[PDB]
Protein backbone atom coordinates (compact mmCIF):
# COMPACT_ATOMS: atom_id res chain seq x y z
CA UNK A 1 0.00 0.00 0.00
CA UNK A 2 1.70 3.17 -1.36
CA UNK A 3 -0.33 6.40 -1.25
CA UNK A 4 0.46 9.69 -3.06
CA UNK A 5 -1.16 12.92 -2.00
CA UNK A 6 -1.53 16.36 -3.57
CA UNK A 7 -1.82 19.67 -1.60
CA UNK A 8 -2.30 23.38 -2.38
CA UNK A 9 -1.62 26.59 -0.45
CA UNK A 10 -2.14 30.29 -1.01
CA UNK A 11 -1.22 33.34 1.13
CA UNK A 12 -1.19 37.15 1.04
CA UNK A 13 0.42 39.87 3.20
CA UNK A 14 0.24 43.69 2.91
CA UNK A 15 3.27 45.96 2.88
CA UNK A 16 3.68 47.96 6.06
CA UNK A 17 6.22 49.95 8.03
CA UNK A 18 9.73 49.10 6.88
CA UNK A 19 12.79 46.96 7.19
CA UNK A 20 13.69 44.13 4.87
CA UNK A 21 11.00 41.58 4.07
CA UNK A 22 11.43 37.88 4.77
CA UNK A 23 10.48 35.54 1.94
CA UNK A 24 11.29 31.82 1.88
CA UNK A 25 13.40 32.45 4.99
CA UNK A 26 15.60 34.99 3.18
CA UNK A 27 15.95 38.60 4.41
CA UNK A 28 15.47 40.70 1.22
CA UNK A 29 16.11 44.48 1.17
CA UNK A 30 13.03 46.59 0.30
CA UNK A 31 11.62 50.11 0.82
CA UNK A 32 8.79 48.59 2.94
CA UNK A 33 8.16 45.54 5.16
CA UNK A 34 5.39 42.94 5.54
CA UNK A 35 2.45 43.36 7.92
CA UNK A 36 1.79 40.12 9.80
CA UNK A 37 1.32 38.46 13.17
CA UNK A 38 4.43 36.74 11.96
CA UNK A 39 7.48 36.69 9.78
CA UNK A 40 4.80 37.74 7.36
CA UNK A 41 6.71 35.27 5.21
CA UNK A 42 4.07 34.55 2.56
CA UNK A 43 6.23 31.96 0.77
CA UNK A 44 6.64 29.65 3.76
CA UNK A 45 3.01 30.17 4.79
CA UNK A 46 1.68 29.14 1.39
CA UNK A 47 4.12 26.21 1.44
CA UNK A 48 3.17 25.13 4.99
CA UNK A 49 -0.51 25.13 3.93
CA UNK A 50 0.25 23.05 0.81
CA UNK A 51 1.96 20.46 3.01
CA UNK A 52 -0.81 20.40 5.65
CA UNK A 53 -3.40 20.26 2.84
CA UNK A 54 -1.87 17.14 1.33
CA UNK A 55 -1.79 15.49 4.77
CA UNK A 56 -5.40 16.62 5.49
CA UNK A 57 -4.24 18.38 8.67
CA UNK A 58 -6.11 21.62 7.86
CA UNK A 59 -3.86 24.71 7.64
CA UNK A 60 -1.60 27.07 9.68
CA UNK A 61 -4.59 29.05 11.07
CA UNK A 62 -5.88 25.89 12.68
CA UNK A 63 -2.44 24.64 13.90
CA UNK A 64 -1.10 28.07 14.90
CA UNK A 65 -3.99 30.40 15.99
CA UNK A 66 -3.89 34.22 15.51
CA UNK A 67 -5.14 34.34 19.13
CA UNK A 68 -2.07 32.61 20.67
CA UNK A 69 0.69 35.22 21.39
CA UNK A 70 3.29 32.39 21.33
CA UNK A 71 3.30 32.91 17.54
CA UNK A 72 3.72 36.73 17.55
CA UNK A 73 6.82 37.59 15.49
CA UNK A 74 7.49 33.81 15.11
CA UNK A 75 10.09 32.57 12.68
CA UNK A 76 7.89 31.07 9.92
CA UNK A 77 10.58 28.38 9.50
CA UNK A 78 9.74 27.20 13.06
CA UNK A 79 6.12 26.86 11.93
CA UNK A 80 7.18 24.99 8.79
CA UNK A 81 9.36 22.53 10.77
CA UNK A 82 6.59 22.02 13.37
CA UNK A 83 3.96 21.50 10.69
CA UNK A 84 6.39 19.10 8.97
CA UNK A 85 7.10 17.14 12.18
CA UNK A 86 3.36 16.43 12.52
CA UNK A 87 3.02 15.56 8.88
CA UNK A 88 5.83 13.02 9.34
CA UNK A 89 4.21 11.64 12.52
CA UNK A 90 1.20 10.61 10.36
CA UNK A 91 3.72 8.63 8.27
CA UNK A 92 4.26 10.87 5.23
CA UNK A 93 7.51 11.56 3.41
CA UNK A 94 8.23 14.37 0.92
CA UNK A 95 7.72 13.81 -2.79
CA UNK A 96 8.34 17.36 -4.04
CA UNK A 97 7.27 20.98 -3.65
CA UNK A 98 6.83 23.90 -6.00
CA UNK A 99 6.29 27.53 -4.96
CA UNK A 100 5.23 30.63 -6.97
CA UNK A 101 5.83 34.10 -5.49
CA UNK A 102 3.54 36.73 -6.98
CA UNK A 103 5.13 40.15 -6.52
CA UNK A 104 5.79 43.30 -8.52
CA UNK A 105 8.95 43.92 -6.46
CA UNK A 106 11.50 43.27 -4.97
CA UNK A 107 13.38 40.97 -7.41
CA UNK A 108 13.05 37.36 -6.22
CA UNK A 109 15.36 35.56 -8.65
CA UNK A 110 18.65 36.34 -6.84
CA UNK A 111 17.27 34.98 -3.56
CA UNK A 112 15.76 31.77 -4.90
CA UNK A 113 18.84 29.53 -4.39
CA UNK A 114 19.09 30.56 -0.73
CA UNK A 115 15.32 29.94 -0.23
CA UNK A 116 15.71 26.47 -1.63
CA UNK A 117 18.55 25.79 0.83
CA UNK A 118 16.39 26.92 3.75
CA UNK A 119 13.33 24.93 2.59
CA UNK A 120 15.31 21.73 1.83
CA UNK A 121 16.96 22.03 5.19
CA UNK A 122 13.67 22.58 7.01
CA UNK A 123 12.06 19.62 5.20
CA UNK A 124 15.11 17.37 5.55
CA UNK A 125 15.16 16.77 1.78
CA UNK A 126 17.48 17.24 -1.15
CA UNK A 127 17.32 20.61 -2.96
CA UNK A 128 16.23 18.76 -6.12
CA UNK A 129 12.82 18.26 -4.49
CA UNK A 130 12.31 22.01 -3.93
CA UNK A 131 11.34 24.52 -6.63
CA UNK A 132 10.65 28.24 -6.17
CA UNK A 133 9.70 30.71 -8.91
CA UNK A 134 8.33 34.23 -9.24
CA UNK A 135 5.89 36.10 -11.45
CA UNK A 136 4.93 39.73 -11.65
CA UNK A 137 1.37 40.74 -12.54
CA UNK A 138 2.54 43.58 -14.82
CA UNK A 139 1.33 46.42 -12.57
CA UNK A 140 -2.18 44.91 -12.37
CA UNK A 141 -4.04 44.26 -9.12
CA UNK A 142 -3.07 44.77 -5.46
CA UNK A 143 0.19 42.98 -6.22
CA UNK A 144 0.83 45.15 -9.32
CA UNK A 145 0.19 48.35 -7.41
CA UNK A 146 2.79 47.34 -4.76
CA UNK A 147 0.13 47.02 -2.02
CA UNK A 148 1.25 43.50 -0.99
CA UNK A 149 2.70 40.11 -1.96
CA UNK A 150 0.85 36.86 -2.72
CA UNK A 151 2.25 33.36 -2.96
CA UNK A 152 1.08 29.86 -4.06
CA UNK A 153 2.51 26.42 -3.43
CA UNK A 154 1.71 22.87 -4.43
CA UNK A 155 3.08 19.76 -2.67
CA UNK A 156 3.16 16.02 -3.24
CA UNK A 157 3.45 13.68 -0.26
CA UNK A 158 4.14 9.92 -0.17
CA UNK A 159 3.00 7.37 2.44
CA UNK A 160 4.17 3.72 2.70
CA UNK A 161 2.06 1.10 4.61
CA UNK A 162 3.69 -0.55 2.58
CA UNK B 1 -1.16 -0.01 -15.93
CA UNK B 2 -1.84 2.43 -13.04
CA UNK B 3 -2.31 6.10 -13.95
CA UNK B 4 -2.29 9.10 -11.55
CA UNK B 5 -3.73 12.42 -12.60
CA UNK B 6 -3.51 15.97 -11.25
CA UNK B 7 -6.26 18.65 -11.64
CA UNK B 8 -6.77 22.32 -10.69
CA UNK B 9 -9.84 24.54 -10.28
CA UNK B 10 -10.51 28.17 -9.50
CA UNK B 11 -13.80 30.11 -9.02
CA UNK B 12 -15.12 33.53 -7.99
CA UNK B 13 -18.56 34.89 -7.04
CA UNK B 14 -19.64 38.44 -6.07
CA UNK B 15 -21.64 39.28 -2.96
CA UNK B 16 -25.22 40.26 -3.71
CA UNK B 17 -28.61 40.64 -2.08
CA UNK B 18 -28.72 38.73 1.19
CA UNK B 19 -29.42 35.53 3.02
CA UNK B 20 -26.79 33.11 4.20
CA UNK B 21 -24.12 32.05 1.73
CA UNK B 22 -23.52 28.43 0.79
CA UNK B 23 -19.91 27.27 0.82
CA UNK B 24 -18.82 23.63 0.57
CA UNK B 25 -22.51 22.73 0.92
CA UNK B 26 -22.78 24.50 4.31
CA UNK B 27 -25.28 27.35 4.90
CA UNK B 28 -23.16 30.07 6.62
CA UNK B 29 -24.75 33.20 8.14
CA UNK B 30 -23.57 36.49 6.56
CA UNK B 31 -24.74 40.10 6.03
CA UNK B 32 -24.85 39.43 2.24
CA UNK B 33 -25.35 36.50 -0.17
CA UNK B 34 -23.63 35.20 -3.31
CA UNK B 35 -24.62 36.26 -6.83
CA UNK B 36 -24.76 33.24 -9.14
CA UNK B 37 -26.81 31.26 -11.63
CA UNK B 38 -26.39 28.73 -8.89
CA UNK B 39 -25.75 27.92 -5.29
CA UNK B 40 -23.03 30.41 -6.03
CA UNK B 41 -21.08 27.87 -4.00
CA UNK B 42 -17.53 28.80 -5.05
CA UNK B 43 -15.93 25.99 -3.03
CA UNK B 44 -17.77 23.16 -4.77
CA UNK B 45 -17.40 24.85 -8.15
CA UNK B 46 -13.63 25.14 -7.82
CA UNK B 47 -13.57 21.54 -6.57
CA UNK B 48 -15.79 20.24 -9.40
CA UNK B 49 -13.43 21.91 -11.92
CA UNK B 50 -10.35 20.37 -10.27
CA UNK B 51 -11.94 16.93 -10.60
CA UNK B 52 -13.04 17.44 -14.24
CA UNK B 53 -9.59 18.91 -15.01
CA UNK B 54 -7.80 15.81 -13.78
CA UNK B 55 -10.12 13.61 -15.85
CA UNK B 56 -9.70 15.91 -18.91
CA UNK B 57 -13.49 16.39 -19.10
CA UNK B 58 -13.25 20.19 -19.42
CA UNK B 59 -15.08 22.12 -16.66
CA UNK B 60 -18.55 22.92 -15.20
CA UNK B 61 -19.27 25.60 -17.87
CA UNK B 62 -18.96 22.95 -20.55
CA UNK B 63 -20.89 20.22 -18.63
CA UNK B 64 -23.51 22.56 -17.14
CA UNK B 65 -24.14 25.58 -19.49
CA UNK B 66 -25.17 29.06 -18.20
CA UNK B 67 -27.77 28.93 -21.01
CA UNK B 68 -29.65 25.86 -19.67
CA UNK B 69 -32.31 26.95 -17.08
CA UNK B 70 -32.25 23.40 -15.62
CA UNK B 71 -29.25 24.62 -13.59
CA UNK B 72 -30.82 27.88 -12.27
CA UNK B 73 -30.62 27.83 -8.46
CA UNK B 74 -29.19 24.26 -8.67
CA UNK B 75 -27.72 22.60 -5.62
CA UNK B 76 -23.98 22.69 -6.45
CA UNK B 77 -23.71 19.30 -4.69
CA UNK B 78 -25.94 17.86 -7.47
CA UNK B 79 -23.44 19.22 -9.99
CA UNK B 80 -20.53 17.76 -8.02
CA UNK B 81 -22.16 14.29 -7.83
CA UNK B 82 -23.07 14.41 -11.54
CA UNK B 83 -19.58 15.52 -12.52
CA UNK B 84 -18.22 12.76 -10.26
CA UNK B 85 -20.49 10.07 -11.77
CA UNK B 86 -19.03 10.85 -15.22
CA UNK B 87 -15.51 10.93 -13.90
CA UNK B 88 -16.09 7.46 -12.46
CA UNK B 89 -17.62 6.23 -15.73
CA UNK B 90 -14.23 6.93 -17.41
CA UNK B 91 -12.75 4.58 -14.78
CA UNK B 92 -11.22 6.98 -12.24
CA UNK B 93 -11.23 6.68 -8.48
CA UNK B 94 -10.44 9.41 -5.92
CA UNK B 95 -6.91 9.86 -4.63
CA UNK B 96 -7.39 13.05 -2.59
CA UNK B 97 -8.62 16.63 -2.75
CA UNK B 98 -7.53 19.89 -1.19
CA UNK B 99 -9.51 23.15 -1.24
CA UNK B 100 -8.54 26.75 -0.33
CA UNK B 101 -11.28 29.32 0.32
CA UNK B 102 -10.08 32.89 -0.17
CA UNK B 103 -12.34 35.23 1.78
CA UNK B 104 -12.07 38.19 4.13
CA UNK B 105 -15.28 37.07 5.88
CA UNK B 106 -17.31 35.18 7.09
CA UNK B 107 -15.16 32.87 9.28
CA UNK B 108 -14.71 29.53 7.48
CA UNK B 109 -12.93 27.49 10.15
CA UNK B 110 -16.04 26.52 12.18
CA UNK B 111 -17.76 25.19 9.05
CA UNK B 112 -14.86 23.18 7.66
CA UNK B 113 -15.70 19.85 9.38
CA UNK B 114 -19.25 19.94 8.02
CA UNK B 115 -17.96 20.77 4.49
CA UNK B 116 -15.67 17.79 4.62
CA UNK B 117 -18.62 15.56 5.58
CA UNK B 118 -20.64 16.84 2.62
CA UNK B 119 -17.72 16.51 0.16
CA UNK B 120 -16.69 13.02 1.37
CA UNK B 121 -20.29 11.95 1.13
CA UNK B 122 -20.72 13.38 -2.36
CA UNK B 123 -17.47 11.73 -3.55
CA UNK B 124 -18.16 8.43 -1.77
CA UNK B 125 -14.78 8.64 0.00
CA UNK B 126 -13.40 8.72 3.51
CA UNK B 127 -13.04 12.17 5.14
CA UNK B 128 -9.27 11.59 5.34
CA UNK B 129 -9.12 12.16 1.57
CA UNK B 130 -10.76 15.61 1.83
CA UNK B 131 -9.01 18.79 3.01
CA UNK B 132 -10.48 22.30 3.16
CA UNK B 133 -8.70 25.44 4.37
CA UNK B 134 -9.16 29.21 4.29
CA UNK B 135 -7.01 32.29 3.84
CA UNK B 136 -7.79 35.96 4.08
CA UNK B 137 -6.00 38.46 1.83
CA UNK B 138 -5.57 41.00 4.66
CA UNK B 139 -8.02 43.57 3.26
CA UNK B 140 -6.25 43.57 -0.14
CA UNK B 141 -8.02 43.07 -3.46
CA UNK B 142 -11.67 42.40 -4.35
CA UNK B 143 -11.67 39.66 -1.73
CA UNK B 144 -10.10 41.97 0.89
CA UNK B 145 -12.63 44.71 0.23
CA UNK B 146 -15.52 42.25 0.80
CA UNK B 147 -16.66 42.46 -2.85
CA UNK B 148 -16.68 38.65 -3.33
CA UNK B 149 -15.21 35.24 -2.51
CA UNK B 150 -12.65 33.21 -4.49
CA UNK B 151 -11.72 29.57 -4.10
CA UNK B 152 -9.06 27.12 -5.41
CA UNK B 153 -8.90 23.35 -5.41
CA UNK B 154 -6.45 20.68 -6.48
CA UNK B 155 -7.34 17.00 -7.01
CA UNK B 156 -5.53 13.74 -7.62
CA UNK B 157 -7.30 10.93 -9.46
CA UNK B 158 -6.28 7.27 -9.89
CA UNK B 159 -7.09 4.91 -12.79
CA UNK B 160 -6.45 1.12 -12.88
CA UNK B 161 -6.26 -0.78 -16.25
CA UNK B 162 -4.60 -2.49 -14.30
CA UNK C 1 12.73 3.64 -8.94
CA UNK C 2 9.67 5.51 -10.33
CA UNK C 3 9.28 9.18 -9.32
CA UNK C 4 6.16 11.37 -9.74
CA UNK C 5 6.40 15.12 -9.56
CA UNK C 6 3.89 17.95 -9.15
CA UNK C 7 4.32 21.51 -10.56
CA UNK C 8 2.39 24.81 -10.52
CA UNK C 9 2.45 27.94 -12.70
CA UNK C 10 0.73 31.30 -12.73
CA UNK C 11 0.93 34.24 -15.19
CA UNK C 12 -0.67 37.62 -15.93
CA UNK C 13 -0.60 40.01 -18.91
CA UNK C 14 -2.28 43.43 -19.39
CA UNK C 15 -4.41 44.35 -22.38
CA UNK C 16 -2.73 46.80 -24.72
CA UNK C 17 -2.89 48.15 -28.25
CA UNK C 18 -4.91 45.82 -30.46
CA UNK C 19 -5.01 42.87 -32.76
CA UNK C 20 -6.16 39.42 -31.79
CA UNK C 21 -4.75 37.91 -28.61
CA UNK C 22 -2.87 34.62 -28.57
CA UNK C 23 -3.91 32.14 -25.89
CA UNK C 24 -2.81 28.50 -25.79
CA UNK C 25 -1.31 29.09 -29.25
CA UNK C 26 -4.70 30.09 -30.71
CA UNK C 27 -5.25 33.52 -32.35
CA UNK C 28 -8.53 34.77 -30.77
CA UNK C 29 -10.33 37.90 -32.05
CA UNK C 30 -10.66 40.69 -29.45
CA UNK C 31 -11.07 44.49 -29.23
CA UNK C 32 -7.58 44.70 -27.60
CA UNK C 33 -4.29 42.76 -27.55
CA UNK C 34 -1.85 41.55 -24.90
CA UNK C 35 1.12 43.60 -23.69
CA UNK C 36 4.23 41.42 -23.42
CA UNK C 37 7.86 40.96 -24.37
CA UNK C 38 6.31 37.98 -26.04
CA UNK C 39 3.32 36.27 -27.51
CA UNK C 40 1.96 37.57 -24.26
CA UNK C 41 0.39 34.11 -24.30
CA UNK C 42 -0.47 33.75 -20.60
CA UNK C 43 -1.78 30.19 -21.00
CA UNK C 44 1.45 28.74 -22.38
CA UNK C 45 3.54 30.78 -19.94
CA UNK C 46 1.66 29.48 -16.91
CA UNK C 47 1.90 25.98 -18.40
CA UNK C 48 5.64 26.27 -19.16
CA UNK C 49 6.22 27.34 -15.52
CA UNK C 50 4.16 24.40 -14.19
CA UNK C 51 6.33 22.02 -16.21
CA UNK C 52 9.64 23.64 -15.18
CA UNK C 53 8.39 23.75 -11.57
CA UNK C 54 7.77 20.02 -11.48
CA UNK C 55 11.24 19.38 -12.93
CA UNK C 56 12.82 21.89 -10.47
CA UNK C 57 14.30 23.86 -13.39
CA UNK C 58 13.08 27.24 -12.06
CA UNK C 59 10.78 29.13 -14.47
CA UNK C 60 10.64 30.93 -17.87
CA UNK C 61 12.19 34.15 -16.45
CA UNK C 62 15.29 32.20 -15.53
CA UNK C 63 15.44 30.13 -18.78
CA UNK C 64 14.37 32.97 -21.10
CA UNK C 65 15.50 36.39 -19.68
CA UNK C 66 13.55 39.65 -20.29
CA UNK C 67 16.99 41.14 -21.07
CA UNK C 68 17.73 38.86 -24.08
CA UNK C 69 16.20 40.38 -27.30
CA UNK C 70 16.25 36.88 -28.88
CA UNK C 71 12.90 36.37 -27.10
CA UNK C 72 11.22 39.65 -28.24
CA UNK C 73 7.95 38.76 -29.98
CA UNK C 74 8.87 35.03 -29.60
CA UNK C 75 6.32 32.35 -30.33
CA UNK C 76 5.50 31.12 -26.79
CA UNK C 77 5.15 27.62 -28.31
CA UNK C 78 8.90 27.77 -29.14
CA UNK C 79 9.53 28.50 -25.46
CA UNK C 80 7.25 25.65 -24.40
CA UNK C 81 9.01 23.15 -26.74
CA UNK C 82 12.45 24.36 -25.60
CA UNK C 83 11.49 24.17 -21.94
CA UNK C 84 10.05 20.70 -22.64
CA UNK C 85 13.20 19.50 -24.46
CA UNK C 86 15.25 20.31 -21.33
CA UNK C 87 12.71 18.73 -19.05
CA UNK C 88 12.99 15.55 -21.13
CA UNK C 89 16.81 15.72 -21.08
CA UNK C 90 16.62 15.34 -17.26
CA UNK C 91 14.68 12.12 -17.94
CA UNK C 92 11.05 13.15 -17.33
CA UNK C 93 7.99 12.13 -19.29
CA UNK C 94 4.53 13.74 -19.23
CA UNK C 95 1.88 12.49 -16.83
CA UNK C 96 -0.80 15.12 -17.44
CA UNK C 97 -1.49 18.85 -17.46
CA UNK C 98 -4.43 21.03 -16.51
CA UNK C 99 -4.79 24.74 -17.30
CA UNK C 100 -7.26 27.39 -16.03
CA UNK C 101 -7.65 30.66 -17.97
CA UNK C 102 -9.02 33.48 -15.83
CA UNK C 103 -10.62 36.07 -18.08
CA UNK C 104 -13.79 38.15 -18.27
CA UNK C 105 -13.58 38.07 -22.09
CA UNK C 106 -13.10 36.94 -24.86
CA UNK C 107 -14.96 33.57 -24.76
CA UNK C 108 -12.41 30.76 -24.34
CA UNK C 109 -14.62 27.69 -24.71
CA UNK C 110 -14.74 27.65 -28.55
CA UNK C 111 -10.94 27.77 -28.75
CA UNK C 112 -10.18 25.10 -26.17
CA UNK C 113 -10.08 22.10 -28.56
CA UNK C 114 -7.56 23.86 -30.81
CA UNK C 115 -5.40 24.81 -27.76
CA UNK C 116 -5.34 21.20 -26.69
CA UNK C 117 -4.16 20.18 -30.18
CA UNK C 118 -1.33 22.73 -30.04
CA UNK C 119 -0.30 21.77 -26.48
CA UNK C 120 -0.44 17.99 -27.13
CA UNK C 121 1.57 18.51 -30.26
CA UNK C 122 4.16 20.66 -28.50
CA UNK C 123 4.48 18.13 -25.64
CA UNK C 124 4.45 15.09 -27.94
CA UNK C 125 1.54 13.58 -25.97
CA UNK C 126 -1.99 12.41 -26.56
CA UNK C 127 -4.76 15.03 -26.20
CA UNK C 128 -6.21 12.97 -23.33
CA UNK C 129 -3.31 14.18 -21.17
CA UNK C 130 -4.13 17.87 -21.78
CA UNK C 131 -6.98 19.78 -20.11
CA UNK C 132 -7.80 23.48 -20.51
CA UNK C 133 -10.67 25.35 -18.84
CA UNK C 134 -11.80 28.91 -18.23
CA UNK C 135 -13.40 30.91 -15.45
CA UNK C 136 -14.63 34.47 -15.27
CA UNK C 137 -14.35 36.44 -12.03
CA UNK C 138 -17.83 37.98 -12.44
CA UNK C 139 -16.62 41.54 -13.12
CA UNK C 140 -14.46 41.52 -9.96
CA UNK C 141 -10.78 42.44 -9.89
CA UNK C 142 -8.33 43.47 -12.64
CA UNK C 143 -9.55 40.48 -14.64
CA UNK C 144 -13.22 41.41 -14.07
CA UNK C 145 -12.66 44.99 -15.13
CA UNK C 146 -11.09 43.82 -18.43
CA UNK C 147 -7.64 45.20 -17.50
CA UNK C 148 -5.84 41.89 -18.25
CA UNK C 149 -5.87 38.08 -18.31
CA UNK C 150 -4.48 35.65 -15.71
CA UNK C 151 -3.85 31.94 -16.06
CA UNK C 152 -2.90 28.96 -13.83
CA UNK C 153 -1.59 25.52 -14.66
CA UNK C 154 -0.69 22.37 -12.77
CA UNK C 155 1.46 19.54 -14.18
CA UNK C 156 2.44 16.02 -13.20
CA UNK C 157 5.72 14.57 -14.47
CA UNK C 158 7.01 10.98 -14.34
CA UNK C 159 10.63 9.77 -14.16
CA UNK C 160 11.84 6.14 -14.55
CA UNK C 161 15.29 5.04 -13.19
CA UNK C 162 13.62 2.46 -13.22
N1 LIG D 1 -12.47 33.83 5.74
C1 LIG D 1 -11.58 33.21 6.46
C2 LIG D 1 -10.24 33.46 6.26
C3 LIG D 1 -9.31 32.80 7.05
N2 LIG D 1 -9.79 31.89 8.01
C4 LIG D 1 -8.90 31.14 8.89
O1 LIG D 1 -8.63 32.10 9.93
C5 LIG D 1 -7.31 31.87 10.31
C6 LIG D 1 -6.68 33.12 10.91
O2 LIG D 1 -5.27 32.95 11.01
P1 LIG D 1 -4.42 32.41 9.73
O3 LIG D 1 -3.04 32.03 10.12
O4 LIG D 1 -4.54 33.53 8.61
O5 LIG D 1 -5.30 31.31 9.09
C7 LIG D 1 -6.66 31.73 8.94
C8 LIG D 1 -7.57 30.72 8.31
O6 LIG D 1 -7.28 29.44 8.84
C9 LIG D 1 -11.14 31.68 8.15
O7 LIG D 1 -11.52 30.89 9.00
N3 LIG D 1 -12.01 32.35 7.39
N1 LIG E 1 -13.40 34.08 -20.52
C1 LIG E 1 -14.13 33.02 -20.30
C2 LIG E 1 -14.59 32.76 -19.02
C3 LIG E 1 -15.38 31.64 -18.82
N2 LIG E 1 -15.66 30.82 -19.92
C4 LIG E 1 -16.49 29.62 -19.82
O1 LIG E 1 -17.81 30.16 -19.87
C5 LIG E 1 -18.57 29.36 -19.02
C6 LIG E 1 -19.79 30.11 -18.49
O2 LIG E 1 -20.37 29.37 -17.41
P1 LIG E 1 -19.43 28.81 -16.20
O3 LIG E 1 -20.16 27.85 -15.35
O4 LIG E 1 -18.85 30.09 -15.46
O5 LIG E 1 -18.14 28.30 -16.90
C7 LIG E 1 -17.63 29.25 -17.84
C8 LIG E 1 -16.37 28.83 -18.54
O6 LIG E 1 -16.46 27.47 -18.88
C9 LIG E 1 -15.17 31.14 -21.16
O7 LIG E 1 -15.45 30.41 -22.10
N3 LIG E 1 -14.43 32.23 -21.34
N1 LIG F 1 9.00 39.95 -8.11
C1 LIG F 1 9.50 39.25 -9.09
C2 LIG F 1 8.70 38.94 -10.18
C3 LIG F 1 9.25 38.21 -11.22
N2 LIG F 1 10.59 37.81 -11.11
C4 LIG F 1 11.27 37.04 -12.15
O1 LIG F 1 11.64 38.07 -13.08
C5 LIG F 1 11.52 37.47 -14.34
C6 LIG F 1 11.28 38.52 -15.42
O2 LIG F 1 10.87 37.87 -16.63
P1 LIG F 1 9.68 36.76 -16.60
O3 LIG F 1 9.61 36.02 -17.87
O4 LIG F 1 8.36 37.52 -16.16
O5 LIG F 1 9.94 35.93 -15.31
C7 LIG F 1 10.19 36.77 -14.18
C8 LIG F 1 10.43 36.03 -12.89
O6 LIG F 1 11.25 34.92 -13.15
C9 LIG F 1 11.33 38.15 -10.00
O7 LIG F 1 12.49 37.80 -9.95
N3 LIG F 1 10.78 38.87 -9.02
C1 LIG G 1 -7.09 32.69 -5.28
C2 LIG G 1 -6.72 34.13 -5.52
C3 LIG G 1 -5.28 34.40 -5.80
C4 LIG G 1 -7.61 35.13 -5.49
C5 LIG G 1 -7.15 36.53 -5.74
C6 LIG G 1 -7.76 37.28 -4.59
C7 LIG G 1 -7.58 38.76 -4.73
C8 LIG G 1 -8.12 39.52 -3.54
C9 LIG G 1 -7.71 39.29 -5.95
C10 LIG G 1 -8.42 40.59 -6.13
O1 LIG G 1 -7.49 41.65 -6.19
P1 LIG G 1 -6.88 42.11 -7.60
O2 LIG G 1 -5.40 42.59 -7.34
O3 LIG G 1 -6.91 40.92 -8.66
O4 LIG G 1 -7.89 43.28 -8.10
P2 LIG G 1 -7.96 44.78 -7.51
O5 LIG G 1 -6.52 45.41 -7.39
O6 LIG G 1 -8.82 45.64 -8.52
O7 LIG G 1 -8.67 44.82 -6.09
MG1 LIG H 1 -3.93 29.86 -7.76
ZN1 LIG I 1 0.65 34.38 6.07
ZN1 LIG J 1 -19.07 29.31 -9.68
ZN1 LIG K 1 3.86 35.74 -19.43
Amino acid sequence: MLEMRIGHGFDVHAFGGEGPIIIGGVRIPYEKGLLAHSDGDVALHALTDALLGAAALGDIGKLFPDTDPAFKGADSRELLREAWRRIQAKGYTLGNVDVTIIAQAPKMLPHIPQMRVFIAEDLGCHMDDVNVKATTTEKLGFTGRGEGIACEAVALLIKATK
Side-chain angles (χ1 to χ4, degrees), chain A:
Chain A
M1 173 65 110
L2 192 79
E3 196 193 8
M4 312 200 56
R5 285 178 77 96
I6 199 193
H8 169 275
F10 172 87
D11 192 21
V12 172
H13 291 288
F15 289 122
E18 78 182 28
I21 64 194
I22 313 206
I23 299 289
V26 179
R27 180 184 260 245
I28 306 182
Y30 196 53
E31 356 312 320
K32 24 198 167 62
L34 281 172
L35 292 188
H37 191 219
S38 77
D39 259 5
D41 186 329
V42 299
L44 298 182
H45 293 175
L47 175 60
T48 305
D49 270 2
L51 291 160
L52 294 163
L57 292 170
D59 70 289
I60 49 158
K62 154 135 174 273
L63 293 222
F64 320 113
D66 249 354
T67 354
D68 201 327
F71 312 119
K72 182 189 184 145
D75 188 347
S76 288
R77 298 182 58 192
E78 242 143 55
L79 304 171
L80 176 60
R81 293 188 300 264
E82 178 52 22
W84 185 234
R85 220 222 348 112
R86 306 203 191 173
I87 288 158
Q88 290 194 287
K90 285 188 77 219
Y92 297 96
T93 55
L94 190 68
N96 84 290
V97 305
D98 189 17
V99 181
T100 312
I101 308 163
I102 298 142
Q104 190 63 32
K107 258 277 171 199
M108 297 295 173
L109 265 168
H111 308 284
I112 279 167
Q114 187 57 49
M115 289 176 203
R116 290 172 77 207
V117 165
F118 286 160
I119 290 155
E121 226 168 76
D122 287 344
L123 298 181
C125 69
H126 194 284
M127 267 184 52
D128 292 353
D129 296 332
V130 182
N131 195 78
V132 180
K133 68 196 100 64
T135 99
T136 136
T137 64
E138 312 288 28
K139 282 278 164 165
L140 297 185
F142 71 77
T143 259
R145 297 193 301 272
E147 297 166 4
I149 294 180
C151 190
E152 300 207 47
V154 291
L156 182 77
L157 304 183
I158 298 166
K159 184 167 160 183
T161 282
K162 142 130 201 181

